[PDB]
RNA sequence: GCUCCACACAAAUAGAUGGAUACGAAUAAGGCGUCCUUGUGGCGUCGCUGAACCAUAGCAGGCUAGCAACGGUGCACUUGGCGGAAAGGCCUUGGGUGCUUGCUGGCGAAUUGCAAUGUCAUUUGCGUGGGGAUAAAUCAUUUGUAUACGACUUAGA
RNA sequence: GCAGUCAAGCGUUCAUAGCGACAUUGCUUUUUGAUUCUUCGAUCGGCUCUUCCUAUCAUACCGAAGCAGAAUUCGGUAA
RNA sequence: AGAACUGGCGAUGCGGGAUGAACCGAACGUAGAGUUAAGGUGCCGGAAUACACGCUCAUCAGACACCACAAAAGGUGUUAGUUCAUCUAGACAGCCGGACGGUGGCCAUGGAAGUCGGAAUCCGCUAAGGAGUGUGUAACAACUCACCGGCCGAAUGAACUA
RNA sequence: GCCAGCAUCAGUUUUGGUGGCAGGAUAAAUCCAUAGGAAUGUAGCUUGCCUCGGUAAGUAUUAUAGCCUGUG
């Protein structure tokens, strides 16, 4: 005896409300927003000992 | 008779010297020899005899034949042509069933209506003798 | 990063040594070569640390260096070119397994007689036949298991019955706290090449009835710079 | 290129076969499917049984007699998969579905006829190896089809009769090919070879 | 599209006080000259103080591979400002041309990381002359002596709808 | 990462004969013969010379490689079973109620019959599988040995034995009655 | 009123316009031929789509004269066997009856006018005279094992 | 809930600003199972009869428990 | 929640989003031919079961997302990367052996010797061996790991990111 | 009067075949010659496993296969 299954149909009211939720959260995050280290010469690169030589 | 009898299951293998028939593209039905292997899907081929340019190609565009010949890895076009001629792969290909089927079908396509009539008459002539034999 | 076996970590005090220990042994053997006159190779495949400590305390003036075969091979020299002194790879090649490489300034014959007269008792060490034969009695087994009058010994501990039953393959039952069997289990016969579980049975019952006598293969003198081979046990 | 096309369902995938068949009927070709019990679905048995149970629990509540009718046979499963593609509520779709016939096993008159396949619906060609699949006779017998033991008993007879037929045809073909080989090398055959026959 | 390699040079515009400025050069992978020049200015704004109105391009040119039939093992440096501070990647590609290496690299990044053209930066593509400098195992797989392998599943493209054959996938 | 080809080796001693069409495997030796179907696996077989059979996988993943290794292990078990055999010794224990273990031949089917387990009148019947031979070990109290060439059938029958006599609704710390596998090995 | 044939006229229409041309099984494997130790065998060979195979000349296919072979095919009889999943079809024996483009000849076609799809593949209905044989149910009545009425269930020359 | 402590990480191109998971302290009244138990302003409940959910009270099968047995407690599948 | 522009609906049909006043495209006379927008091309359904590179198996996957909610992570499912380490003076995994000595260290207790507890936690000899990682004993014993060595013969481990 | 066919033209449009040219590193390449170099090491040679001639590690830079780089 297998049980129910949720539906994936989106019922337009929900996608309108989600758009509004996100449009509000974006403003709130923009408002809270008001309050490099270069990773180097990575290994496994075989010809890495040549980049050390263009310096001088 | 108490030795192991494991099967073989022969296969056309992707190897240098393996000759292949190009079934789609600009060449469209020409031969070439695999000279190098780029990955599981790509190889480098070269046919100077039939006139295909040396190129990288996916394996879906070609189809391996059972024929192969001696060829070093990463050969050039001239060495490819020399080994091609020395092995004489074109004659083996012409002798194979497969190429005969292709030649037969293009002949049938190039047949004229009058030749079609001739073929029908000849088939009737042959049918008489064969049914007599049976 | 997943579908691997997790390493069982535990939190103890000691920690691994690494390359520094090996370099230290290297420098020690190389500076002792220049110091002492004679150097010997001793094959010590299965030892007890108290026996090794007895051998060491027998002379505090002479040195004994254990360690890794391949490290001592490099310190001496395995090639005739790569070598510390002359005709030395001729000695370095003799090393077979667990080698205790000894340095001394003492006479050849004292060492030669000491390491053949020295003999101790030890376990039978599997892959080596034992000069003994043991049927366990068919009643209750005791801690020595058929070596002395049972009126001296006590029955072994009940906690060993899973071990005896599973790992040693002995047929075993227990009536109350005592372990018991129905028939006399024979474990070994003299001149029988021993296996792991037979050795563990004899160890559990406490049987050191094998002759440990250290083997010496070769010998090298610095002033002469020559090798000399003498298999003496 | 024929008046009627007989399709052996063995080794095929239900949805792809349904699609090609539907688009053929709507174009006007008459098609007859056989051996639906040997049909295949992608995914493991458990998944598709769960799916059929999901379909089977659906039913009109105030009267079960007027709800989705859950047909258990493989032919009817295939018919459902197909009818869901066709606009069966139109006269055009009705006329299309009336060009179709689905059978469990190969009954007469189609046993004495040629069958074909659809290579863009075969399991062995479409699926990647190392992938679980499901077969429809097993599924239908799980969900209550009480006839899989008769169809096997009958196919075991059909196959024997067909083997006799093939053993006769194969010797006849040997005779014919030998006579043709003997007739070969004649100038008529050389001319035919030149002209491509 | 199918990329091309473009040489680009920029002059930042002369002044009195400074005739003949320093002519910075770059190599770009891109479909066409418009995109190449936009990328040129995009990198030059990061490196130095220049602007499309404050500067000019001198010589756009194309670079074709010297040996576009010789098979090669390329090593590529890549970086992408995500999600943290920028972090680098080294990849290896067996191919004939830098263009093909870059194309299959962009496709592989889009597949395996959902990282995009806008997100990606090409530092350096470099042919590896000597074997035993090849580090990655999936490229090491293909350098072995007298390499052979089959294709055991053949499936044949069919032009028709129906077939009378019960087809076979052999080789 | 789609390993281009992976291989495993299978050693065949002299008395053994191995026959392999598509993925069916027949192994014949002194103790008997064995058959096994491996069509679910999608690997490739090949022979080198009468003592070494290789199994190969082309362009496969982790699960495929695991399938290769376990195929090797299965064939090795077949060879060991046809050469030496498999022998499992089980012991049955009781505290108060002597468990009576016998054999019965019912419609020619070889059932093992267990009686009086923990003082019940139910008679527990275990069917013996084909290729398995039961004997009651002499001069060893309450031990039974299962011998054969199929390790699968032997071990599964022993498991059926030790499962049919499980204790129910009682502290197993106290109630030790049951049938247990004492030893596994060869003949 | 029904019934077999010696058929004037009506009928072919979810869509004829050469032929729906029969092994099973597998696909990290198979088909065909051949040999022998009969097997999970040896050898050879094939695929790489039906782009095949078979039919296919004659006025929508005529009227005739021959050559060579005893083959091919149609129509109606005729022998025997098989087939029950929805068998309704498959094969076979014989003798008739025509045709044969396997090969060589002789006559006719025309005006459908420069194309018009240019029509070609059962019977019920009335001539047909084949032309003889002679059942039920329902209503009404009745029964009550049934029943709102219908229905159901029984009986009655 | 309030106010705090700590610290795995995050950390204006900050080492000594800030944020901060998991843990954790205080307040709630008391230490000797005497607590006499003691209610303090809301703008519904009851018949017939059917079905459904599981977030299972009982029945069925299992797991872990100082589970001797007996009974019981916790939990898994299960409507 | 308040104010300030802007755009649209209200007054507005058309194509698409399965359907929809305010979303995408695009604004309207009646017809014909061609090309497109947005959206789409397995069948319903007009249009590639097209080509190419990868990834993914979900015991009710997914088929526009939004560090918009469930939200902060968890997982021995998978793939690709980054950093740090070990390694022919032999790494990882397996087996085998060693795993000591002062010492049964001091308090405590009916007893506790590395392992009920409190607090020291040192030196020696070593290749290495904790005043001891766990099982266990009334206490010892025995086993075990931590650490070292022998056999094996080439790659391996951990932490992170996506 | 009604429905149609064809030829040659005009306007709008769609879809094929073919030719001549200009550029770019005056494409790069391929190809030819030449100087070096090396390995996923060709021939030859050395020592061995050694199942009748296949073999492992050492040598040797084109030899009785070739490849790479530069220059022209």
Tab-separated table of N, CA and C (backbone and C1' of nucleotides) in Angstrom, chain D residues 10 35 38 151-152 154-165, chain G residues 23-25 85:
chain	number	residue	atom	x	y	z
D	10	UNK	N	8.880	-7.469	-28.462
D	10	UNK	CA	10.027	-7.920	-27.689
D	10	UNK	C	11.205	-6.965	-27.840
D	35	UNK	N	3.340	-9.824	-29.008
D	35	UNK	CA	4.294	-10.101	-27.935
D	35	UNK	C	4.462	-8.879	-27.035
D	38	UNK	N	6.410	-9.529	-23.616
D	38	UNK	CA	7.861	-9.422	-23.603
D	38	UNK	C	8.339	-7.981	-23.705
D	151	UNK	N	0.111	-18.215	-22.131
D	151	UNK	CA	0.794	-17.624	-23.276
D	151	UNK	C	2.159	-18.262	-23.468
D	152	UNK	N	2.850	-18.589	-22.376
D	152	UNK	CA	4.128	-19.282	-22.499
D	152	UNK	C	3.934	-20.681	-23.065
D	154	UNK	N	1.673	-21.683	-25.033
D	154	UNK	CA	1.307	-21.599	-26.443
D	154	UNK	C	2.472	-21.135	-27.314
D	155	UNK	N	3.267	-20.188	-26.816
D	155	UNK	CA	4.445	-19.746	-27.548
D	155	UNK	C	5.454	-20.879	-27.680
D	156	UNK	N	5.510	-21.763	-26.680
D	156	UNK	CA	6.411	-22.908	-26.755
D	156	UNK	C	6.017	-23.872	-27.868
D	157	UNK	N	4.758	-23.824	-28.306
D	157	UNK	CA	4.305	-24.641	-29.428
D	157	UNK	C	4.527	-23.913	-30.748
D	158	UNK	N	4.206	-22.618	-30.759
D	158	UNK	CA	4.415	-21.788	-31.937
D	158	UNK	C	5.875	-21.809	-32.370
D	159	UNK	N	6.790	-21.749	-31.401
D	159	UNK	CA	8.214	-21.726	-31.700
D	159	UNK	C	8.671	-23.030	-32.341
D	160	UNK	N	8.106	-24.153	-31.895
D	160	UNK	CA	8.464	-25.448	-32.474
D	160	UNK	C	7.994	-25.523	-33.921
D	161	UNK	N	6.741	-25.126	-34.159
D	161	UNK	CA	6.231	-25.111	-35.529
D	161	UNK	C	7.070	-24.200	-36.422
D	162	UNK	N	7.424	-23.018	-35.916
D	162	UNK	CA	8.252	-22.096	-36.681
D	162	UNK	C	9.642	-22.663	-36.937
D	163	UNK	N	10.182	-23.438	-35.996
D	163	UNK	CA	11.495	-24.036	-36.197
D	163	UNK	C	11.448	-25.081	-37.298
D	164	UNK	N	10.373	-25.869	-37.337
D	164	UNK	CA	10.184	-26.803	-38.446
D	164	UNK	C	10.136	-26.061	-39.779
D	165	UNK	N	9.329	-24.996	-39.832
D	165	UNK	CA	9.234	-24.171	-41.034
D	165	UNK	C	10.605	-23.662	-41.471
G	23	C	P	11.338	-16.295	-41.695
G	23	C	O5'	11.245	-17.168	-40.369
G	23	C	C5'	11.238	-16.539	-39.099
G	23	C	C4'	11.111	-17.539	-37.980
G	23	C	C3'	11.541	-17.053	-36.606
G	23	C	O3'	10.541	-16.298	-35.947
G	23	C	C1'	12.517	-19.154	-37.025
G	24	G	P	10.808	-15.725	-34.471
G	24	G	O5'	10.810	-17.023	-33.549
G	24	G	C5'	10.861	-16.910	-32.138
G	24	G	C4'	11.934	-17.786	-31.543
G	24	G	C3'	12.920	-17.093	-30.622
G	24	G	O3'	12.393	-16.882	-29.324
G	24	G	C1'	14.074	-18.552	-32.093
G	25	A	P	12.620	-15.481	-28.578
G	25	A	O5'	14.148	-15.535	-28.142
G	25	A	C5'	14.628	-16.606	-27.345
G	25	A	C4'	16.134	-16.647	-27.307
G	25	A	C3'	16.837	-15.322	-27.070
G	25	A	O3'	16.846	-14.935	-25.707
G	25	A	C1'	17.887	-16.461	-28.849
G	85	A	P	-4.920	-23.385	-29.308
G	85	A	O5'	-5.172	-21.882	-28.860
G	85	A	C5'	-6.353	-21.516	-28.159
G	85	A	C4'	-6.594	-20.034	-28.250
G	85	A	C3'	-7.138	-19.555	-29.592
G	85	A	O3'	-7.969	-18.409	-29.405
G	85	A	C1'	-4.992	-18.625	-29.229
